Design a protein around this ligand. Structure first.
Ligand SMILES: N#Cc1ccc(Nc2nc(N)nc(Oc3c(Cl)cccc3Cl)n2)cc1
Lengths: 552, 427
């Protein structure tokens, strides 16, 4: 019940001191409900009848929720906790199945009542003191102090996992085949013996643990595989997601659209190709929790397609360190990219996606690199290494772009995989002005308050134009001006602008952007033979941009 | 070891709790390295394993010593440094020689090996807790705290300081002209002798240190030349101003001048003395771009006049030791990288350019890291401090591979910029 485990010394935050909270009402029936418990608890040693001497106090309650046979003592350490030091974290990050290793037999022991078996740093006990009131006279009050790890306390999960880890170490050594992972009231044991032998080892471990006061039960309530864990469904050689449920409704409210999207990402770990660009586009209004949102046309289409996917069950395999780790990505098209990581051709190891949420302008190659990075990071966490890649881009493209790009990059081992769609530079801007080419001195300003602007050009050839625009901003005019010149220029053109904004955007060599204006432009860029853009300081600058601004 | 000393009390700045920094996931390979290392460190008593009552944590990495047969543990004490070393920049500040940059040569030797004798005040260890990770986090991390002054922690140099001057004093005596400066874990020794004497004057030091305890692994090679260049040799008197020169040209086109008007207009933020109108007026037209055009009244005047206010460093540019040094690095392409180091926009305390070789053997991420470490060393050598870098590279990529070619024993600070604009032009 309690062990010769060494105790972890504890402490209260620097200035603070023990909790002195009281609660002296008495439900006669319950008082005898607790007393029974304590007597069977002090008898077992987990607590002690304490002497009235400075103990601070803590709330004691009796509980019985459903299908009663027994009660449950419950102390509220919310005030003791708020006074105890910080401890090393627990599971800063939950291990991913995609990276766990194949096993024959897996067993789970119930290590629930365990912590009461683990010792409490003597000195710190003095604070654990609660007080069970004797029914009325305002008596001395049957009073106790904890000797083990209080169910509520701050440092229990820690001090526990700590202790348990130590007790296992030896066993763990003398038995490397056995993976032992504990998860709160659970301690899983997995191996490669055949159920008979496997259950020998289980018992040994069981007995070993017993030698350390931590006991365990043989059989009590739930079932075995699949193991419902951390929203996963675990099998001895396959793994998958908890049955997910896409609801169907007449009206969806933000909170409803959220829980829907969340579930979808979750389902993406393994269900290939799931998309989410649309349903989240809707949640882009972060206010209400019950504001109703009309599933737009796309969102619906999308959600749908997500059902055809989830319709069919799908599961994933484990990691075999003898084989290679491969990774493949494909562009879905709306800034959506997908990938699946495997070692073997048919079942996957894991899948996932990479959307370009960030901002409102980006290229197809940079995005490819962003996705390749997201996976690199993911692999390092999960397999401890980088996967080999297979991607829809040809060196000529890549090697070119990373050469032109102003940012440093490092894309790893990658093999080209010719399969649509494809990633490429749909067009390149010239590096030197084009001789003979008509020069368009573009410009366009807008009235910040009247939201009225103009976009025009004046060419070397004496050609002009000015188009009145309403409901836009300089940036919009600054672009429309470049779009203008493109429309009216010929296959080759030299365009001069005074806007860094505009200049950049174009130069970023964007593949697309739902900003239909930039589209109209990007697409003209594609249709041209040779374009050359040139920046030129605004205000003080050239005299041609002046001659258009005086106009606007 | 028999207690070389008996500990120096260390207290963080009030209103300051020790570090609690997450520990980046790592390559299996690298975990094994760390694992191995710490196992020894644990035997040697340098480090002990800790419990759950130690909530603190500083990150740890594995780097290649200097490509030697094995790895090196590089504790990223940056967090704990700010939380202490700053008030031990005072409490025990190691004074910086303004002449070291003037030496004909400065060598850098690793003396971080010294500290591992000196036990660390006990009430402090708890804060050096660093965690070696588990792949996929299947297993709870292995945990350790430091029993001795640890490398990387700027309170180690400071505590050993005392003991160092002692070790070095009977040498600075017979070498009153050689300057020795200590930064964290390295000794920067500078002499005005022909290299030959210098290098020797160094092994003369290498051994003085050696016969008095310390060990400087710094034995880079031997008589046989498998083309592996010698110890870290910097030449700071040749640390000089870089080229920021306009283009001299026979025939000037409308385009050419345009750019030229921009470069200058950009420069006007560093040099309020530049002008362009007479140069710009030459463009007031809407002429072609391939069209070549000639000067103006004082055009040739302004281009040469400016071309002068631009060939002499700027003024009012003084080093404020209160501020932090800042460094931008823009990718120049084809293996080159420029860099400014400043404390207030445009008032550059120093600029320069790094560059690697030709394709086949080098990438971006390696270059940058190399540039960063060269800019940091330069900065250390000149001001006694490292600069906050404004890195032009997707955070995550950087976080993923910086360690891949890191050889420095320190971690400058840094952040990522997503936009170097016209700057790459001007520089
Ligand atoms: N059913 C099932 C099942 C359970 C566990 C595994 N394989 C496995 N391998 C390793 N290295 N670590 C772990 O650890 C775990 C265990 Cl044993 C149980 C629950 C979660 C985790 Cl992370 N499991 C395989 C199948």
């Amino acid at each position: 019940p309690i062990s010769p485990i060494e105790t972890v010394p504890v402490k209260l935050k620097p200035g603070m001191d023990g909790p002195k909270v009281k609660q002296w009402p008495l439900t006669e029936e319950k008082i005898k409900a607790l007393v029974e418990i304590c007597t069977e608890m002090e008898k077992e040693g987990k607590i002690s009848k304490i002497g009235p001497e400075n103990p601070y106090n803590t709330p004691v309650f009796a509980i019985k929720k459903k299908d009663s046979t027994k009660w449950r003592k419950l102390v509220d350490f919310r005030e003791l906790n708020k006074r105890t030091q910080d401890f090393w974290e627990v599971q800063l990050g939950i291990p991913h199945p995609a990276g766990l290793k194949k096993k024959k037999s897996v067993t789970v022991l119930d290590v629930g009542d365990a912590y009461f078996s683990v010792p409490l740093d003597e000195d710190f006990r003095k604070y654990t003191a609660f007080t069970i009131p004797s029914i009325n006279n305002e008596t001395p009050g049957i009073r106790y102090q904890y000797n083990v790890l209080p169910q509520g306390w701050k440092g229990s999960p820690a001090i526990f996992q700590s202790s348990m880890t130590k007790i296992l170490e030896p066993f763990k050594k003398q038995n490397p085949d056995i993976v032992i992972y504990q998860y709160m009231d659970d301690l899983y044991v997995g191996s490669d013996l055949e159920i008979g032998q496997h259950r020998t080892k289980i018992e040994e471990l069981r007995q070993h643990l017993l030698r350390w006061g931590l006991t365990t039960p043989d059989k009590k309530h739930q079932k075995e595989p699949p193991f419902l864990w951390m929203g996963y469904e675990l099998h001895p050689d396959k793994w998958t997601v908890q049955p997910i449920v896409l609801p169907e409704k007449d009206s969806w409210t933000v909170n409803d659209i959220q829980k829907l999207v969340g579930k979808l990402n979750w389902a993406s770990q393994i269900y290939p190709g799931i998309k989410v660009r649309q349903l989240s586009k809707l949640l882009r209004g972060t206010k209400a929790l019950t504001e109703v949102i009309p599933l737009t046309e796309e969102a619906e289409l999308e959600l749908a397609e997500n059902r055809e996917i989830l319709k069919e069950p799908v599961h994933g395999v484990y990691y075999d360190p003898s084989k290679d780790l491969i990774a493949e990505i494909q562009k879905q098209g709306q800034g959506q990219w997908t990938y699946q990581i495997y070692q073997e051709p048919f079942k996957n190891l894991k899948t996932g996606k990479y959307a370009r949420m960030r901002g409102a302008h980006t290229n197809d190659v940079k995005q490819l690199t962003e996705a390749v990075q997201k996976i690199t990071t993911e692999s390092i966490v999960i397999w401890g290494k980088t996967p080999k890649f297979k991607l829809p881009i040809q060196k000529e493209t890549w090697e070119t772009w990373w050469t032109e790009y102003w940012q440093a990059t490092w894309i790893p081992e990658w093999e080209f995989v010719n399969t649509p769609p494809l990633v490429k530079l749909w067009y390149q801007l010239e590096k030197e002005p084009i001789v003979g080419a008509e020069t368009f001195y573009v410009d366009g300003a807008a009235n910040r308050e009247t939201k009225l602007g103009k976009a025009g050009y004046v060419t070397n050839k004496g050609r002009q134009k000015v188009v009145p625009l309403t409901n836009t901003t300089n940036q919009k005019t600054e672009l429309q001006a470049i779009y203008l010149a493109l429309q009216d220029s010929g296959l080759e053109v030299n365009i001069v602008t005074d806007s860094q904004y505009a200049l950049g955007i174009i130069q970023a060599q964007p593949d697309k952007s739902e900003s239909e204006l930039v589209n109209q432009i990007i697409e003209q860029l594609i249709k041209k033979e040779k374009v050359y853009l040139a920046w030129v300081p605004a205000h003080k600058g050239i005299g041609g941009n002046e001659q258009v601004d005086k106009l606007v | 070891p028999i207690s070389p000393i008996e500990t120096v009390p260390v207290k963080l700045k009030p209103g300051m709790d020790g570090p609690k920094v997450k520990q980046w996931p790592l390559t299996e390979e690298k975990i094994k390295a760390l694992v191995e290392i710490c196992t020894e460190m644990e035997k040697e008593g340098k480090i002990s394993k800790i419990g759950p009552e130690n909530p603190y944590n500083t990150p740890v990495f594995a780097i290649k010593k200097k490509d030697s047969t094995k790895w090196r543990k590089l504790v990223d004490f940056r967090e704990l440094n700010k939380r202490t070393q700053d008030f031990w920049e005072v409490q025990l500040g190691i004074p910086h020689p303004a002449g070291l940059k003037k030496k004909k040569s400065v060598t850098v030797l690793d003396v971080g090996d010294a500290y591992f004798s000196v036990p660390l005040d006990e009430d402090f260890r708890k804060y050096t807790a660093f965690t070696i990770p588990s792949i996929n986090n299947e297993t709870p991390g292995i945990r350790y705290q430091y029993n001795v002054l640890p490398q990387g922690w700027k309170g180690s140099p400071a505590i050993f300081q005392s003991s160092m001057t002692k070790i070095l004093e009977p040498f600075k005596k017979q070498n009153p002209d050689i300057v020795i400066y200590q930064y964290m874990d390295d000794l920067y020794v500078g002499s005005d002798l022909e290299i030959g004497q210098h290098r020797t004057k160094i092994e003369e030091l290498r051994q003085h240190l050696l016969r008095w305890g310390l060990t400087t692994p710094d034995k880079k090679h031997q008589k046989e030349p498998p083309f592996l260049w010698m110890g870290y040799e910097l030449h700071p008197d040749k640390w000089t101003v870089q080229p920021i020169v306009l283009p001299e040209k026979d025939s000037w086109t409308v385009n050419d001048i345009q750019k030229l008007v921009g470069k200058l207009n950009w420069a006007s933020q560093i040099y309020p003395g530049i002008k362009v109108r007479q140069l710009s007026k030459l463009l007031r037209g809407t002429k072609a771009l391939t069209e070549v055009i000639p000067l103006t009244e004082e055009a040739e005047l302004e281009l040469a006049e400016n071309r002068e206010i631009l060939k002499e460093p700027v003024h009012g540019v003084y080093y404020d030791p209160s501020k932090d040094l800042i460094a931008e690095i823009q990718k120049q392409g084809q293996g080159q990288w420029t860099y400014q180091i400043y404390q207030e926009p445009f008032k550059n305390l120093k600029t320069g350019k790094y560059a690697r070789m030709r394709g086949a053997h080098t990438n971006d991420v390696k270059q940058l890291t190399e540039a960063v470490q060269k800019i940091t060393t330069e900065s250390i050598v000149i001001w006694g401090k490292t600069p906050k870098f404004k890195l032009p590279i997707q955070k995550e990529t950087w976080e993923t591979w910086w360690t891949e070619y890191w050889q420095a024993t320190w971690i400058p600070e840094w952040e990522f910029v997503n936009t170097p604009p016209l700057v790459k032009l001007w520089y």
